[PDB]
Design a protein around this ligand. Sequence first.
Ligand SMILES: Nc1nc2c(ncn2[C@@H]2O[C@H](COP(=O)(O)OP(=O)(O)O)[C@@H](O)[C@H]2O)c(=O)[nH]1
Ligand SMILES: [Mg+2]
Length: 164
Amino acid sequence: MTEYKLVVVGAGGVGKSALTIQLIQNHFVDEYDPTIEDSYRKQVVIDGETCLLDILDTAGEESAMRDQYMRTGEGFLCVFAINNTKSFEDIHHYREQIKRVKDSEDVPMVLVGNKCDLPSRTVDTKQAQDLARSYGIPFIETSAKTRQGVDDAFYTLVREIRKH
Ligand SMILES: Nc1nc2c(ncn2[C@@H]2O[C@H](COP(=O)(O)OP(=O)(O)O)[C@@H](O)[C@H]2O)c(=O)[nH]1
Ligand SMILES: [Mg+2]
């Protein structure tokens, strides 16, 4: 079946691991080693197409797998936490890294505002929508805890990859 190679990036603590594990096995993880970087594969059906999502959950330092995923990844989830202003301000660094390593101005990407269940929002929805518009990319609000938007985030990224 078709495989889509996806990479999850963003500041420490924004919920990259929790979003990945919620997608993979439908559970919310309260604590996941901030240094563990692993890849996961899930069969899904997106717009009728049975396919494999091949996901690297990046973490942190100098690996062969991470280098290969950055170079050959087909699409990137750029994650910030809606209660962490710095993580949102850091988003442009991750986008720039992707453009540099891919040597391309046109890389499939989705902006993800995670932790939307929390009572501590400091990044307005419109603020992130405005950023995504300037980048020309989709924006999806998610919660790895409630599952809001989790499938939508990954599936939207697949649909962006398909356009490439
Ligand atoms: N309430 C809430 N907590 C979350 C969400 N996503 C992640 N977390 C918590 O945020 C902390 C950091 O998440 P983690 O997945 O390790 O972040 P990572 O460093 O980007 O991999 C953990 O305690 C998670 O349980 C969310 O959508 N809602
Ligand atoms: Mg992690």
